[PDB]
Design an enzyme around this catalytic site. Sequence first.
Site, PDB file in Angstrom:
ATOM      1  CD  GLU A  52      -3.629   4.670  11.302  1.00  0.00           C
ATOM      2  OE1 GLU A  52      -2.555   4.979  11.880  1.00  0.00           O
ATOM      3  OE2 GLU A  52      -3.650   4.180  10.178  1.00  0.00           O
ATOM      4  CG  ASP A 109      -0.363   0.001   2.528  1.00  0.00           C
ATOM      5  OD1 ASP A 109       0.081   1.099   2.968  1.00  0.00           O
ATOM      6  OD2 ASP A 109      -0.270  -1.093   3.134  1.00  0.00           O
ATOM      7  CG  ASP A 121      -5.907   4.163   7.863  1.00  0.00           C
ATOM      8  OD1 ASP A 121      -5.872   3.873   9.075  1.00  0.00           O
ATOM      9  OD2 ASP A 121      -4.951   4.665   7.237  1.00  0.00           O
TER      10      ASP A 121
END
Length: 208
Positions: free
Chosen positions: A97, A6, A95
């Site tokens: 986080e 990624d 994502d």
Amino acid sequence: RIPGFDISGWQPTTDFARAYANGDRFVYIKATEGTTFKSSAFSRQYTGATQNGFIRGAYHFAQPAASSGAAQARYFASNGGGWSKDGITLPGALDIEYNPNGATCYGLSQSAMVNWIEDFVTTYHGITSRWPVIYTTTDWWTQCTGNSNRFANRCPLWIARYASSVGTLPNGWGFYTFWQYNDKYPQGGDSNWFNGDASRLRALANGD
């Protein structure tokens, strides 16, 4: 297992022919963050992946205090996170986080965070037909969601842990779908494993 990687706008350079020769077969590419950020690298990267035989998807960096999950799912789906059933498009990834600008859980309670994620993934599925992948860490997920099992039966897990083994998964998931195991992709970026064979990677892209 299948290798992949990624990238985001942090990486100036990605030669996708070289990546395919390395044996990589999929790539996730940063598209959006919040409701205001679209990566200026996304189009070059997503096009390069397409042209060089990759299975590819996009990811969205969640900002749970800035706006609703629905607003961010709409922004993501309109700006790189769209899906089509062409065998080469992964479902978009959320994502979710550590807060990169402050306190790790963004000031939300655990239940409020679960509701925010629910709003994102329900909205994304209503737009695209796909449940998104969830990228997180077990420690963040534990502190900030109360280790919620609410998404495991819809959303494939993309777990991050840079270690010799994947470690403990968040509650609800029996297995990882992707494992981000280093931040040292040779051309820049992070390295991932997909937990399955080529047929299963294609099935994830196809959504069936």
